[PDB]
Amino acid sequence: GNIFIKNLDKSIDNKALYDTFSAFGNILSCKVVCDENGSKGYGFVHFETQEAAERAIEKMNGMLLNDRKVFVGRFKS
């Protein structure tokens, strides 16, 4: 159950990403990808289950998160 999240507002850090996505399922790992300029505006969440991943896509893809609409889909780790 892995998802990508793109068009993440750059104020979203790891703890915030977890807080939002932990509603959907058991999060084993998550991260906001960063570089020397901070957040790269995308992130990944690893759910324990596939069902959780699909709930997250159903509920969050195309939805506002802070000041941007995010793109959420399945990723192969």
Task: DSSP letter for 1, please.
Answer: -
Residue 6 tokens read as 């793109």
Q: Report CA dihedral (13, 63, 7, 58) to the nearest 10 degrees.
A: 90
Domain span including residue 47? 1-77
Beta strands in the chain (DSSP E): 2-6, 27-35, 38-47, 64-65, 68-69, 71-74
> Total structural domains in the chain?
1
CB 43 within 8 A of CB 17: yes
Residue 66's H or E segment, with its range, is none
CB 77 within 8 A of CB 19: no
Q: How far apart are CA 49 and CA 38, in angstroms?
A: 30
Residue 64 tokens read as 């506002």
Resolution in A: 2.0
Domain CATH number, residue 5 = 3.30.70.330
- How was this model experimentally determined? X-ray
Q: Is 65 helix (H, G, I), strand (E, B) or coil?
A: strand
Q: How far apart are CA 60 and CA 50, in angstroms?
A: 15
